[PDB]
Amino acid sequence: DMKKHLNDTVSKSFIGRFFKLEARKTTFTTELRAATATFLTMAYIITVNANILADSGATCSINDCVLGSNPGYEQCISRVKKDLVVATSLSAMVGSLAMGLLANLPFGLAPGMGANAYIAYNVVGFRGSGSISYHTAMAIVLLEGCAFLAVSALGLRGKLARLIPQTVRLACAVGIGMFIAFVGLQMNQGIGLVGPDKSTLVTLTACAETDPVTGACLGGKMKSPTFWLAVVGFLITSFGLMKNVKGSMIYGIVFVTAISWIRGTQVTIFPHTPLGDSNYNYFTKIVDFHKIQSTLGAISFTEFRKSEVWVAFATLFYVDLLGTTGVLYTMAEIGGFVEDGKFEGEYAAYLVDAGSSVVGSALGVTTTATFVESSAGLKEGGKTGLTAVIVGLYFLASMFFTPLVTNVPRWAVGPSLVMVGVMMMGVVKDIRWGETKEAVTAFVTILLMPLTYSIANGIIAGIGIYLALSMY
């Protein structure tokens, strides 16, 4: 019986009374279990979001040498990838802690997919491409976060995110899902299923004897030793949604990485090059305390005088308004929160999702949103902020394992990137495909995002068609 003794020494204490444990009937153990489930569902991103931003033009320029395979640049990119893990863990612990404390909402915060890909692979490019360097991207994040905080402070978001047509938002979500799936197939961040061609633009080039320098290959199709390991990892992950295990994405990532940690095999991650020797020597120790040394703060408000920047600002505004106008209300009816027209926390909910982006802009991360993959805790129990606090505590006591998170091979996150798109595509059945007016714009927005390799292009081409087709 002493189990229930833990629910009277806590509920009647200050901690229980502060969160109103007696109201919205629940127990401390149930809230802890819900927090554990929603952490296991979400924990993947700490190693997924680290590998996307790392290969996105690190802070060191040619002065510390880009794409020429020089060990000097490789050491810097290793250090930067080491720092972004801690940065993402900190940005997930904060925000989640505020949402737990400022409001009584059992949610979680972390830099989600979709804004990280946008600023990572379109404006900063792949290791020095694009138009704007790394500092200007974080300046843009700062400006967008401040603007969204101002907009949510005194009410316009409800009156601004409701006038957008109901089809463009869903089409944009599907297009972002397709693009995040597409980016996980090239031999730059993905597994290597898609390669270049001369006659056509795309061609199946799972390719064994590949060219290390450029990216082409010299014969051998669908016989890559690492591509098949990635495929079996994807199958292991996919056999985790059926039969409904708690967390399967991290299970597949862990299995693939653990198989890859063997030294000497053809799918290894620690080769005999001295880069591999240094990586292994760092990997010997498991627990390591790391302090940010490179991307602690780097903001430059000196290039806000040209174009190709404010377009990114508008696109980030549109994507972040798409993200939050949706998931927040959706994961309110699952629990016993929704009333006739109120959340009892909606106003305080929108404030944190914008406030904990200013703290992340000068930290190494992108804008954050409440995770949709957190209903695994709501569907069990817990009605107050005893899950957000525990999630923040977990993320805080998950950054000490940096050596086990900075050596994940890039072919272990390809399945995760593909599965994110599969999960996102599920909303495509709510679009009214009957009328031509919605079908044309939805199809254009969906198709133009992965083919042209741009999200802003898709949004700007979907808005124009919908505007022109209704010129009355």
Enumerate binding residues for a copy of itself (CB under 8 A): 125-126, 129, 178, 181-182, 185-186, 193-197, 199-204, 235, 238-239, 241-242, 421-422, 425-426, 428-429, 431, 433-437, 439-440, 443, 447, 450-454, 457, 468-469
Query: How far is it, in rounded angstroms, from Cα 454 to Cα 461?
Result: 11
**Closest CB to a copy of itself among 259 and 447?**
447
Instruction: Please enumerate in sequence order all residues whose Cβ is within 8 A of that of 78, keeping only pairs 6 or more positions apart, or say none.
Output: 275, 278, 279, 406
Q: Which region, judged by CB under 6 A, interacts with ligand ZEA, from 132-140, 216-224, 293-301, 370-378? A: 370-378
Residue 323 engages ligand ZEA in binding (rule: CB under 6 A): yes
**Closest CB to a copy of itself among 9 and 330?**
330
Query: How far is it, in rounded angstroms, from Cα 353 to Cα 102?
Result: 12
**Closest CB to a copy of itself among 240 and 381?**
240
Minimum gap (Å) between residue 453 Cβ and a copy of itself: 4
Give the one entry of ligand ZEA, a copy of itself, none that residue 113 binds, where binding means its C-beta sits below a cut-off of 5 to 8 angstroms depending on kind: ligand ZEA
Query: How far is it, in rounded angstroms, from Cα 377 to Cα 373?
Result: 9
Give the one entry of ligand ZEA, a copy of itself, none that residue 276 binds, where binding means its C-beta sits below a cut-off of 5 to 8 angstroms depending on kind: none
Residue 53 engages ligand ZEA in binding (rule: CB under 6 A): no
Instruction: Please enumerate in sequence order all residues whose Cβ is within 8 A of that of 358, keeping only pairs 6 or more positions apart, or say none.
Output: 142, 145, 146, 149
Give the one entry of ligand ZEA, a copy of itself, none that residue 242 binds, where binding means its C-beta sits below a cut-off of 5 to 8 angstroms depending on kind: a copy of itself
Which residue is associated with the tokens 């009605």? 383
Minimum gap (Å) between residue 69 Cβ and a copy of itself: 16
Q: Which region, judged by CB under 6 A, interacts with ligand ZEA, from 187-195, 252-260, 371-379, 459-467? A: 371-379
Residue 371 engages ligand ZEA in binding (rule: CB under 6 A): yes
If phi over 0 gives left and psi between -120 and 50 gives alpha, with beta otherwise, what is residue 253?
alpha
Query: How far is it, in rounded angstroms, from Cα 381 to Cα 24?
Result: 11
Query: How far is it, in rounded angstroms, from Cα 170 to Cα 176?
Result: 10
Give the one entry of a copy of itself, ligand ZEA, none that residue 150 binds, where binding means its C-beta sits below a cut-off of 5 to 8 angstroms depending on kind: none
Contact call for residues 438 and 431 (beta carbons, < 8 A): yes
Residue 195, SS3?
Answer: strand
Helix and strand numbers, DSSP H then E, in the chain = 19, 4
**Closest CB to a copy of itself among 90 and 187?**
187
- What element of type H or E holds 24? none
Give the one entry of a copy of itself, ligand ZEA, none that residue 369 binds, where binding means its C-beta sits below a cut-off of 5 to 8 angstroms depending on kind: ligand ZEA
Residue 144 engages ligand ZEA in binding (rule: CB under 6 A): no
Give the one entry of a copy of itself, ligand ZEA, none that residue 396 binds, where binding means its C-beta sits below a cut-off of 5 to 8 angstroms depending on kind: none
Residue 380 engages ligand ZEA in binding (rule: CB under 6 A): no
Give the one entry of a copy of itself, ligand ZEA, none that residue 168 binds, where binding means its C-beta sits below a cut-off of 5 to 8 angstroms depending on kind: none
Instruction: Please enumerate in sequence order all residues whose Cβ is within 8 A of that of 208, keeping only pairs 6 or more positions apart, or say none.
Output: 217, 219, 220, 223, 224, 225
Minimum gap (Å) between residue 452 Cβ and a copy of itself: 4
**Closest CB to a copy of itself among 72 and 426?**
426
**Closest CB to ligand ZEA among 323 and 382?**
323
Residue 327 engages ligand ZEA in binding (rule: CB under 6 A): yes
Minimum gap (Å) between residue 54 Cβ and ligand ZEA: 18
Minimum gap (Å) between residue 372 Cβ and ligand ZEA: 4
CA atoms within 13 A on the CB side of 385: 22
Minimum gap (Å) between residue 380 Cβ and ligand ZEA: 19
Give the one entry of a copy of itself, ligand ZEA, none that residue 314 binds, where binding means its C-beta sits below a cut-off of 5 to 8 angstroms depending on kind: none
CA atoms within 13 A on the CB side of 10: 15
**Closest CB to ligand ZEA among 194 and 372?**
372
Closest CA to 50 of 88, 77, 90: 88
CA angle, 41 then 45 then 46, to 5°: 115
Residues in contact with ligand ZEA, total (CB under 6 A)?
Answer: 13
User: For ligand ZEA, which residue of 40, 80, 93, 115 counts as binding (CB under 6 A)?
Assistant: 115
Closest CA to 317 of 95, 120, 161: 161
Minimum gap (Å) between residue 26 Cβ and ligand ZEA: 24
Closest CA to 319 of 119, 182, 178: 119
Contact call for residues 427 and 455 (beta carbons, < 8 A): no
CA atoms within 13 A on the CB side of 38: 34
Minimum gap (Å) between residue 387 Cβ and ligand ZEA: 16
Helices (H), 284-397: 310-333, 346-361, 375-378, 388-396
Binding site for ligand ZEA (CB under 6 A): 112-115, 320, 323, 327, 367-369, 371-373
